[PDB]
Structure formats: C-alpha cells, structure tokens
Structure 1
C-alpha cells in the first residue's frame, strides 16, 4: 500500500506528466473516462499507488498539475486522457512568469505556493502509507525551475523523510531553446543538490539521438519524446505496482545508488528499443537487452560514462526471465568493462526483477546510472553561466524583482563544488 504523489511543474512538466499518466493508465487498464476495462487482477492488485477510488467507480490520479499561467493545462485538459485529472488539482495564477527563475520563485511563484501546498497536503492526507513525491519539471524555465524548486524545498521541510524524486529536463549541450537557460539551470540545481533525494537528468539532444539512431521514426515529435521519458518513469516504479522475484522501491534504489548525500544525479535509460525495420532482425533476449541497456548511445543524457566512471548502477527488469543470466550479464559487463566502474566499490550493479512486462513486450529493462560523467553537464552549465555573469547579461530582471549577485555567486560555488566532488570520486584510488 506504498504510494507516491505525482507533481507536474512548468509546461514541460505538464506535458510530460500527461504523457506519463496516459501511458500508466494504458498499463493499468484505465479508460479515458476513469473506469477499469482491463483483463487481469494484477492491474487492480496495486492500483492504489497512483489512483484513488472515487465513490462511483472512477479512478482519479494522485497528481498535482501546477502552472503559473493557464497555458498548456488547457492542452492537457482538451487532449486525450485529460479528463481523468481532478479539476481541483490544477493550480494556476492570473499572470505568467515564463523562463525567469526569480519571477517563478519569488514574485509569481510565492503566490501559488500556498494553494499548491494545500492540494499536496490534501493528497498526502488521502495517502495512508505515503512513499514520497515525484515531481517532473525542466531546467531552463520559470515555472519548471523556479516554482518547481520552491515546491521541492517546501515539501522538503514538510516531509523530511519521504522519498523525493525529480525528473528534470536539463539543458542540452547544443541548441539553446532558452537564452537564460544557464541562469535557470544553475540557480535551480543549487536547490536540487540539497533538497532532492534523487534527480534524473534528461536532455532533448540525447533523446532525439535515441529517436533517430535507434528508432528511426523520421519525425520524432514531443509525444514520442515524452513517451520515452514516461516509459523510463513507469520502469523505475515497477516493483511498487507488480509482484516480482526481486523487489526494489524508490527508497531501495536511493539507498543502493546514492553513496554520498550530494551525489544523486543519474542518467536514465530504457532499452527495449528497436527500429521498425529491424524488429525482424533481433531476438528479445536478456544478453541483447543488457548490451543495449549498457550501450552509451542509449543514454538519455549527453554525458559519456566512457569518459566518466560508474559509481553505482541500477537495472530494473520486467518479464518472466531467469535470475542467473541476469546476474551473469551484470557481472560480465563489469568484468569486461572494468575501466568505467570505480574499483573501490565491488559489484556496484543492483538488480530488480519484476514479473509483469509492459503491454506488447516479452521483456523489458530500465537503467539508472550514477556515473561521474555527469560532471561534464555541470561544467558546461558553469562556464555558460560565467560567460554571462562576467558581463551581467540578462541580470537586470533578476536584480529588479528581488535578488542579489550573492545568490548567483553561491549557486556557481555550489555547482563547482559538485564538479570537484564528482572529479575527486572519479579519480580516487582503490587503496
């Protein structure tokens, strides 16, 4: 009866959470009306982790949709699978900040925060065995960065023991999509380091590369982009919903994957992923699943674990497989590629096998990696931040509605401290 509360922040968070909720409703056999039309008892075995029994047979998702301006929530409500959400779980203000951390965290985000906190308190009271909170947002916005990090902080002092997951769409190394994006990313990870239990860094450049060099797909479309991220989201919380041979919840993943309290930025990965012209040329087996799971091209972040060092690895399998060959592949990957695994931790791969695969697949696997390669992303954001901060680019707003240069200085210092920590634990010796 463990259960988490989903929380979408920003327009990116709103679309990606709508995609996540519709795919998890497809997984649990929930119609767009809200009733149940599946074909097994295992779908209602653990329906309470994501859904609440409304009196009348309807299943309402345990989600809080937050936006500063009623923008993409209109699209969420007017699209398919958008009527399941409770209309009291949509929170909006009359203005809208947009790609501004200071307006999303101090001026406009400080007015909606009381209503969002009231809604989240109501959802957690509706919970009886709450596991934690799962917030989806993007680094490089105003509501996703500012309001999202404000929510993460507020719920951190509200519930200091529940497991806090963030799915953060991080800036890509190439193509900007926002010009104050280094500012928002730095000023948001300054909160994400010390206020989240685990953070999954996701970037559109690597996801587009997955969509072309892995699935071809000609036209990727953000529907399929958020589908890939939502498939990872469904994979990471599989043992909470279905029986398996080796259970591992979010607390288990955090315990086995976080060696030091600041080092909790992961690279997600989901790898049953085959181009439609090559479905006839592959065999869906555990060794091939492991190979494509540990392949560097499959990674959803632009950082290179070949350039870095794997501290910890979590592999969550789905399907009726053997245990011996799964364990053998996880040992064999390290025993061959021992230069990408730090050798002061022995057998740093955790295995979590669940019985039920997703619909349409014989087997599945999702990959959560805490490499030291993620320091390249923070190095990129740090130098892109200082190239602007050394000439006070776009800083007149951030000084206008109420910050100092000291906040940016502290955020840059915290990022560089994280980079130095990742470097020292990358090049630390065995003895």
Structure 2
C-alpha cells in the first residue's frame, strides 16, 4: 500500500525525528502512547505508509534511528516519546566518530553495517509494497554524512526499482560547524548523486534567517528549527497520506522535475507569520503565493534571482480552488517570465490536497527548481580546493584507508554538476 521505511543518521540527523514523528502522529491523530485517538475518518485510508500495524493499536513508527555515538541517542530515549520506537531498531555504536568522513563512511560504520542491513531487510519484506526510503542526515558531520552513504549504496545495490529520496542540511556560508565540513560536503555529494535520485539542501543559517526575518524571534533554538523544516517532510507526503482531489506522489514528483539524472531543488512553506502577525491578514492563496516567491521564504542560501526556475510543483492543502491558483500563478509567471526556463513552457505542477493543518485554514509546500544551486557548489568548490592546496588535514583521512586521489575525483564530480548548470543558467 505504497509505503515508506525511514532512515536517520547522525546526531542532528536523529534530532529531526521528534519534529517529524510527533507531527506525523498529530497529522494522523495519534498520541505519545501510540494508541489511537483521531477525530475524522479521513485520516486512515493511507495511514499505513509511515506505520507498521501492531497488536493492540500500538502502530509502531517504521524507523531505524542510527548513530555512531551514544551521546544523543539516549536523549530521545530517556526523554519523552520513549515508547514510540521499538528498541530493536534503535542501534548505535559507542566509539566516537570524530565527525571525520571515512572514519564514519568507510570503517566504523563497517563495524555496524552488518547489523544495519539485517534490520532493514526484515522490515522491507514485511511491508506490502515499498514506495521508497528516506535518508535524513547532515552534509557537514561524519556519522550522518558518512555512514548513511555507505548505508545507501548497499540499499541501492539491493532495490534498484525502489526510489531513494534523501533530505540533508547544508554547510553554511558563514555559520559553519567544523573545518572538515568542506570535505564532508564534497564526499557526501559523491554518493548522493551517483546512487539516490533526489536530495534537498537546507541551510541552518538561512533557516536562522527565517525566524529572524519573518517570525521575528531574536533567540530560537534547534527545537524550533527542526520544528519548522519538519513540516515539509509532512508537506511532501501531505498530498499522499490522506485523500484529496488530484494528488501525486514523490516518484511522480521525481520524473516531472528534472530533464536529466541531476536532481536538486528548493523547499519553502506557506503560510507563515509571527505571534502578533497572525490575525492581521487575510490568509488565502494570494497570501500563499507571495510567500512562495521570495528567497526569504526559501531554505537554500542561494538566489533564485541569480538563478532560473527549471520546474515548479506546488502542494496545497485546505479548501482551495484551481483558478485561485491559476489566475495567481499567471499573475506572477508573467512579471517573472525571464525567471522561467524557456526549454519548457508551463513547468508548473499543481496538486491540491484536502484537509488543513492544525489551526490554519490553508497550507502550501514549495518545490521550485533552480540553476543557481551551483551557487552552493561554487561556494563549496573553492572552499574545498583551497583546503587541498596544502593537503589540509589530510592525515585524518589517508590515515584511515582512502587514497588521496580518490578525494580528487569528487572535485570533478562537483565540477561535472556545475558544468551542466553552467549551461542552463544562460543557454537555449
């Protein structure tokens, strides 16, 4: 019944579970205890996606929370929601990853990979029909950046028809975590592009701009940060997980987007407001569409005004027509006609879902494609290569088992991406 098995990796790659899973329970009317409490009968017919049925209504979240160090793993165990996940799927090593890629990709995950795949296999064939797999991790760290990629390439070597879809979070332009965060980003992209289809890129610093610019809070914390970018994982399945009028799926959101095997694009929300900014509007699709236009409601630290929109899919939920979107999309595609790609007339995808979220009459989820996602990788590439000139921190990788020229290959892998996005910025 078109279902997904969930995979996390890394510390903050595991932190996103609670913003995900407590929402998707609340989106499906489900408590902390797992037992059922839902209002409408609308929220059942596609409930089977992110949940395996249980004895006595428990409705276990199909997930495997994976990490290399037991620091943050007990935190969601010993905290609340300690009875949602089944601890057979909680696995974690003890020795530190040191957030070094090949330590996390090549060798210490290989201590734990043998326990990984026997977990997800018996999860896979107990499902009816897999729709796909989700990988949420980091680009910057080591555990999520390294171990999930080796974890990915085995799964893509087992299920070549099944779709592989990934979420990940970006290195920052200014607010970076560590100094090998250039190396981890390049090495992560070497496996994402080759194995999985689609990956999205979320700057924490641009996420920090959101509550700064839009919601006006001087001091949010990460439990507000993941709480916001949670709902796009809700939003991509919003179309899917309960009925509507039109909606399609992530594989149908895969083939429509890109004319090539080269899949990266953007994320945004609609609507969005502050505390006191709530009631002073008229929340509607013209209110929705303009928070689906700015870079300020995006996640990528790159300018669509520097870029060009390849393809757009829009995912609405609530009482919403088409012509309220039609007349409004036409009102903004005309003034911004040079912002579209002339390879495709009408690269707009419309999808209308039924029920609203909590306390909001409408909601929309943004998917727009760009040429300026190279503005990440050009900002990455010279951030990468300048730390290769003196072979910066090289012995923490070649002192673990990887050839240095294998690291040089991923540069051209990044440059193979940019070489295409060099063209469709200005060609045709």
What TM-score, normalized to structure 2? 0.98
CA–CA separation in structure 1 for the residues paired with 2:119 and 2:332: 45
Aligned residue in 2 for 1:354: 353
CA shift, 1:73, in A, is 1.4
CA–CA separation in structure 1 for the residues paired with 2:254 and 2:348: 13
SS in 2 for 1:111: helix
CA shift, 1:272, in A, is 1.2
CA shift, 1:69, in A, is 1.4
1:69–1:94 CA contact under 8 A, matched in 2? yes
CA–CA separation in structure 1 for the residues paired with 2:393 and 2:356: 48
Aligned residue in 1 for 2:186: 186
Aligned residue in 1 for 2:290: 291
1:269-418 mapped onto 2 (5 Å cutoff): 269-418=268-417
1:193-232 mapped onto 2 (5 Å cutoff): 193-232=193-232
CA shift, 1:78, in A, is 2.1
2:132 aligned with 1:132: yes
Aligned residue in 2 for 1:73: 73
CA–CA separation in structure 1 for the residues paired with 2:348 and 2:330: 8
Q: More deviation in 90-99 or 151-160?
A: 90-99
CA–CA separation in structure 2 for the residues paired with 1:12 and 1:257: 28
CA–CA separation in structure 2 for the residues paired with 1:239 and 1:405: 45
CA shift, 1:273, in A, is 0.8
SS in 2 for 1:152: helix
CA shift, 1:18, in A, is 2.4
CA shift, 1:144, in A, is 0.8
1:49–1:240 CA contact under 8 A, matched in 2? no
- Structure 1 gaps of 5+ residues are none
CA shift, 1:218, in A, is 2.8
CA–CA separation in structure 2 for the residues paired with 1:134 and 1:61: 13
CA–CA separation in structure 2 for the residues paired with 1:346 and 1:355: 28
2:377–2:414 CA contact under 8 A, matched in 1? yes
SS in 2 for 1:371: coil
2:1 aligned with 1:25: no
Aligned residue in 2 for 1:108: 108
2:44–2:242 CA contact under 8 A, matched in 1? no
CA shift, 1:43, in A, is 1.9
SS in 1 for 2:64: strand
- Structure 2 gaps of 5+ residues are none
CA–CA separation in structure 2 for the residues paired with 1:211 and 1:24: 23
SS in 2 for 1:372: coil
The Cα offsets for residues 150-196 of structure 1, whole Å up to 9 and x where unpaired, read as: 11211111111112111101101012211100000001101111111
Aligned residue in 2 for 1:243: 243
1:17–1:136 CA contact under 8 A, matched in 2? no
CA–CA separation in structure 1 for the residues paired with 2:322 and 2:384: 47
CA–CA separation in structure 2 for the residues paired with 1:275 and 1:387: 41
CA shift, 1:205, in A, is 0.7
CA shift, 1:45, in A, is 2.2
2:80 aligned with 1:62: no
1:18–1:82 CA contact under 8 A, matched in 2? no
Aligned residue in 2 for 1:11: 11
Aligned residue in 2 for 1:87: 87
CA–CA separation in structure 2 for the residues paired with 1:233 and 1:330: 24
Point out 4+ residue stretches in structure 1 off by more than 4 angstroms: none
Aligned residue in 2 for 1:423: 422
CA shift, 1:98, in A, is 3.1
What TM-score, normalized to structure 1? 0.97
CA shift, 1:271, in A, is 2.0
2:165 aligned with 1:165: yes
